[PDB]
Design an enzyme around this catalytic site. Structure first.
Site, short mmCIF file in Angstrom:
data_model
loop_
_atom_site.label_atom_id
_atom_site.label_comp_id
_atom_site.label_asym_id
_atom_site.label_seq_id
_atom_site.Cartn_x
_atom_site.Cartn_y
_atom_site.Cartn_z
N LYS A 63 -13.48 -30.20 -48.09
CA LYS A 63 -13.77 -29.93 -46.56
C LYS A 63 -13.21 -28.57 -46.25
O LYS A 63 -13.69 -28.05 -45.16
CB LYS A 63 -13.20 -30.84 -45.71
CG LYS A 63 -13.98 -32.39 -45.75
CD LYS A 63 -15.36 -32.08 -45.88
CE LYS A 63 -16.14 -33.35 -45.53
NZ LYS A 63 -15.37 -34.34 -46.43
N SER A 89 -13.41 -41.38 -53.91
CA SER A 89 -14.84 -40.74 -54.18
C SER A 89 -14.68 -40.06 -55.35
O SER A 89 -15.79 -40.12 -56.12
CB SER A 89 -15.06 -39.89 -53.02
OG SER A 89 -14.43 -38.77 -52.77
C1 LIG Z 1 -16.33 -34.91 -47.68
C2 LIG Z 1 -16.29 -35.92 -48.63
C3 LIG Z 1 -17.19 -36.25 -49.60
C4 LIG Z 1 -18.57 -35.93 -49.49
O1 LIG Z 1 -18.89 -34.58 -49.44
P1 LIG Z 1 -19.92 -33.81 -48.41
O2 LIG Z 1 -20.23 -32.46 -48.82
O3 LIG Z 1 -19.69 -34.12 -47.22
O4 LIG Z 1 -21.36 -34.72 -48.77
C5 LIG Z 1 -16.76 -37.04 -50.40
N1 LIG Z 1 -15.47 -37.55 -50.73
C6 LIG Z 1 -14.33 -36.88 -49.88
C7 LIG Z 1 -13.14 -37.62 -50.22
C8 LIG Z 1 -14.76 -36.29 -48.98
O5 LIG Z 1 -13.74 -35.74 -48.00
#
Ligand SMILES: *Cc1c(COP(=O)(O)O)cnc(C)c1O
Ligand SMILES: *Cc1c(COP(=O)(O)O)cnc(C)c1O
Ligand SMILES: *Cc1c(COP(=O)(O)O)cnc(C)c1O
Ligand SMILES: *Cc1c(COP(=O)(O)O)cnc(C)c1O
Lengths: 319, 317, 316, 316
Positions: free
Chosen positions: D42, D264
């Site tokens: 981010k 993620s």
């Molecule tokens: C923002 C985020 C994502 C997804 O990324 P985008 O570029 O916004 O699609 C995946 N995992 C985490 C922990 C995130 O903060």
């Protein structure tokens, strides 16, 4: 990553591994100083000398600098003078490759040549003379402590950082102003006491080890005297190197590794291979490559090199 | 960190700001491709073609590479060949400089001379001939997609990353094989549509603007034909530049900024400046500097350059 | 370019200039060691110790590493163990946050706890027993020369290279193992003897200044003994710092510069500001930032920080 | 070289190779975004969104930024504002981790708690109201072109530069705002059309496949609405990942590779390994690692922690 001045690209040169020239049970890495914008390790002292001067109030915008350009130092000062807004005047022999001349005039340097038969110091003299006569600034590449200083903080840090946690047994270098050997050596002796600092000298000009000196062709090395910026206590091994073996090794580095450097670079690599030949299994050596071989096209580095078509070779293909 | 091979140092060249050669209401940046080990932008296409041939299985160990070259391409291919352990054969006319010959030979390259007047197309026949006769690999700098492909992945990436979140209005470049213009232009088109892709060519060789070519002096620029690897749709502004202007600009870059680059570099900086002159306040330009000026001493880059001391100016006061 | 292992990312951390926290007539730079993969400067000694042992033939993949830790060393060692195929056992006092426990466990490390009051002196004794009992490898961060050695080769080189041809007048750092102080200090002596090595200790734990010690809260700093790796001759100015000033300065850094680091980092920055306040025009200082403040949430770093909404502020 | 501001270290994150988790007939590389100062990917959108507003004149000194966040966007926006000298206001449910709040607090961010249930678009409109009411700046992460832009110029450039002249068959990433997928995908399509862009979605939140959403535990992914910033033309394969398998892969990454990343990240690596199992020899995959695992200590990523002492284990 966007850079303000081209002078910001000085230093942080790459250290690469020789792929085939070294004995299999050995590892020989090499530091390419031709990556500096000035095409040589001199970019370091030239930048360091000038920045030290400015902070010391010895240099002001528009000022003039003068030095006895044997070759690279002149080109680096000319480049740094040009980039920072200074005037540059160098004194080189009457008989000196017209290429080392055009190079200086490229960066906008005002050149003044004297009869080459003046044994160098002639210009070295007319350097300080013309200096005080107009209040011009003198680099003093041989006595200005900013020289070994820049090497302590950049060159040595680059070598130390690259080999951290890894094996390194030999560091090979020749000396001209001795700034490299002094700076890197002082840093190495304290940080890596086990690394042997190997300093080489041209076979005929073994000034340090035999007080003798004779005009050699390993350009950039052994001047007719000993620089005061030198700290020979740093040297663990003092050796000699034949200018022919050095010239030949420079040619091999190019055709066998793709690294096109000059004579002194061939000398350091030769010394490294020498040590490597009989060194224990797993020995790691580092050699300094001071400059690009591109400014040597008119020297003994290209003596005995064919200029015509390779007919003979083509013939050997169909028979 | 340590590098395994000298080829791992290719690319990631610096972009520096001109400190005084540009209108105070403008910012002119320059990409110095002379930082490549081979001293020119061609290191990229040379590496790309070889790594590509190896992946397609067209280049096995100890193989030899042939190419009809006259400038930086031969030096680059030779260097790459020397580093990879391949044999390289440069096919070039005898009219070309000797220094150029010594460079290729320094890297262990084999030289095959042919009557200069024969011209490019002539020597290309020679290279094609040898290639078939002995089963050697042909680089084909003008048609190998790996050439522009590498600029899309490296050159463009370096430019995009350095200017990310920063202003950039014009990207100026000339073209030889057009690999640089095509590759960087295709990436900018998607990432920064606002940037004008300015493609310059030698006036007496405005081969694209007016389909006319004739012996010019901006070494490396506009061949006498149209490369099959080019994508014209990428050009925003097609202009011309004068060799004398290019030449002078190059001499200025060196003396006023400390950046010693070739004539084609002088050409781009010249067009970049011309645009800068009558341009909005705050505009930003980036110009490509193809190679090092150190290999232009035997060129009109030093037409009437004093070869001896000037004790005349030595007394003024 | 591509990296082969996560371990090849250790070091080469950034030095950033504080934008508003320092006196205008002065320049304060900060070395952010939280950029290391392990979140702190300890990644340097953990990598160095293990690589040295491997070269020495003392460590072989599959072996077990054990070490007394306050938190960071454990995480670093645990991370390197996970990366090189070693087992890791940490000896830590219950006094430290359970969040320092999860961190060591996250990397698959094993945890052995002892009474917090025994301090580093007691854990070291425990780590040692287990070492003999099971033939486990002892890292010995306070005596292993590999600790200060890696700082001479990396930290120092990064600092020297970053300031080559530039003004640098002060270098501020606290000490735990004293590896940073000793390594950077000895190289500063050789290359830039003028620069002043400023070494701070917690007010209540001046082990060097007054030979006194007492449980403090500036984590990472001042153990209950003098590390053998130490070389006092490197210190030019020995000063003290109060944990509350440290704690508060770390908060200021985060909120005023965007740099979120730990408490010892608050201490070194505070010490740098203090010096900078009464320092001559153009004075350049550099403070070491040992770790990320992300591992200080359940610590007095967040003593009484409003865990609730400030509707009051919204009133306006 | 010295860095002027902490924001100048955003991006240029390392790509590292997995040493023991990938099938030997394969290579799995991973892009570690946790190396960003803010601890997550981010940092890219936060910086980009601000420099864009500034250039557009939508942001002036002292101006204040507001946004409803509970994740990494808030933290990133918080840090950036703190380094840029803007005021930051976070809007999140009062039932959220007291630590997620602490993080925003650390960077000097204001806090306005609200009913957890009304989370989703609710807390957003609460920020929307505050925006027009007070004339405050809204990032619009899900619709702001500057999000994908910065990814096309930095993230994609870092990937293309690192893999130039090397093999690369698959790129794996999940999506939240979809800025990474969109940005990297658009540039990938142009320079490497043969690289397969794989977009995963949580098992119970297949928004792209059939427009179905449900609360899940893979933090950062699958919002309850298809973002306008998305470009579906760059997706080669749309797959799903179970949140448990993700959670477990993250654990494996840390313990087996020494790389500590969020849920993620475990999810993308899980997908990459799955693809790799039956992929031809020499296949190379790259997976995005969105954030540091350090801010997941109070999540299911740490269930069954066993925070005591490994006394039992010691018995043997
Ligand atoms: C923002 C985020 C994502 C997804 O990324 P985008 O570029 O916004 O699609 C995946 N995992 C985490 C922990 C995130 O903060
Ligand atoms: C300057 C130089 C050297 C020697 O380096 P010092 O740092 O002066 O000791 C070696 N070779 C060449 C070509 C040089 O220009
Ligand atoms: C190759 C070259 C160019 C043109 O670059 P392309 O990518 O081939 O279009 C320009 N100048 C010089 C000196 C060159 O060698
Ligand atoms: C290790 C540590 C220090 C002290 O560094 P040394 O090099 O061991 O002296 C300071 N602060 C923290 C948070 C540490 O972990």
């Amino acid at each position: 990553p966007l850079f303000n001045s081209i002078l910001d690209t000085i230093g942080r040169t790459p250290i690469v591994r020789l792929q085939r020239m070294a004995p299999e049970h050995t590892s020989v890495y090499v530091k390419v100083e031709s990556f500096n914008p000035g095409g040589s390790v001199k970019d370091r002292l030239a930048l360091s000398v000038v920045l030290d001067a400015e902070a010391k109030g010895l240099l002001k915008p528009g000022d003039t600098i003068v030095e006895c350009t044997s070759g690279n130092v002149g080109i680096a000062l000319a480049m740094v003078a040009a980039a920072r807004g200074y005037r540059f005047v160098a004194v080189m022999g009457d008989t000196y490759s017209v290429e080392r001349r055009k190079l200086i005039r490229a960066y906008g340097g005002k050149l003044v040549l004297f009869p080459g038969h003046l044994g160098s110091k002639g210009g070295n003299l007319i350097a300080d003379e013309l200096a005080e006569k107009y209040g011009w600034f003198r680099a003093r590449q041989f006595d200005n402590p900013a020289n070994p200083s820049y090497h302590r903080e950049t060159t040595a840090s680059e070598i130390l950082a690259d080999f951290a946690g890894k094996r390194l047994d030999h560091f090979v270098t020749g000396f001209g102003t001795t700034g490299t050997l002094t700076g890197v050596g002082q840093m190495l002796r304290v940080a890596r006491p086990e690394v042997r600092v190997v300093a080489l000298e041209p076979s005929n000009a073994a000034m340090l080890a035999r007080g003798e000196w004779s005009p050699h062709q390993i350009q950039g090395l052994a001047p007719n005297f000993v620089p005061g910026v030198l700290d020979r206590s740093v040297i663990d091994d003092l050796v000699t190197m034949d200018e022919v073996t050095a010239r030949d090794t420079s040619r091999r580095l190019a055709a066998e590794e793709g690294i096109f450097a000059g004579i002194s670079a061939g000398a350091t690599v030769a010394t490294a291979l020498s040590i490597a030949e009989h060194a224990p299994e797993g020995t790691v050596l580092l050699a300094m490559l001071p400059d690009t071989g591109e400014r040597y096209l008119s020297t003994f580095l290209f003596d005995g090199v064919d200029e015509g078509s390779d007919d003979a070779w083509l013939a050997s293909l169909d028979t």
